[PDB]
């Protein structure tokens, strides 16, 4: 698709069976999607941005789908309000900005 | 240009005759820039990102130019991990993600 940016650009995507709503994000270097229960073991780490850091978990290797999309990769967990889809992943799915 | 996700998305910027490099974010609604003196009465703003609640200096109609290309929009400057251009002014500079 070529998505504007007049809004936010939520997106479906699915992780097991969930279905979720997420932004696509180029300025995140990760995925963190709000908390879930993910199989497998899971690192601590911290992320930051706006305000602070926050600390998240570290799963590797889930498939998301984002829209018909079959990304696997790093996904870290934890209080975010917004899911978010970074970097790791856009690139998986070929995600491009252009002007 | 075509800009691709593997690396940051990070541009140089012309704003108040100064050249910086920002981060092209498409999950952020504003734009918001490392404590800078820019021209112009400000409002005292309060915003927030993974971390939380922060105070800004918001200053409106400011000239900034992206890659060559131009915008005229609000700016705000605070404790930013890095600048970041947001959705505001990428719509004015007809930036879409593509994928």
Redesign the interface.
Known sequence: ??????K??LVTIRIGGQLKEA???????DT?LEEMNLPGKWKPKM????????KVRQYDQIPVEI?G?KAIGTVLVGP?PVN?IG?NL??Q???????
Chains 1, 2 share one sequence.
């Open positions: 698709p070529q998505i504007t940016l007049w936010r650009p932004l696509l994000d180029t300025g995140a270097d963190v992320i930051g941005g706006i305000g602070g850091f926050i829209c999309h975010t978010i970097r856009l690139t799915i070929g995600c491009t900005l252009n002007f």
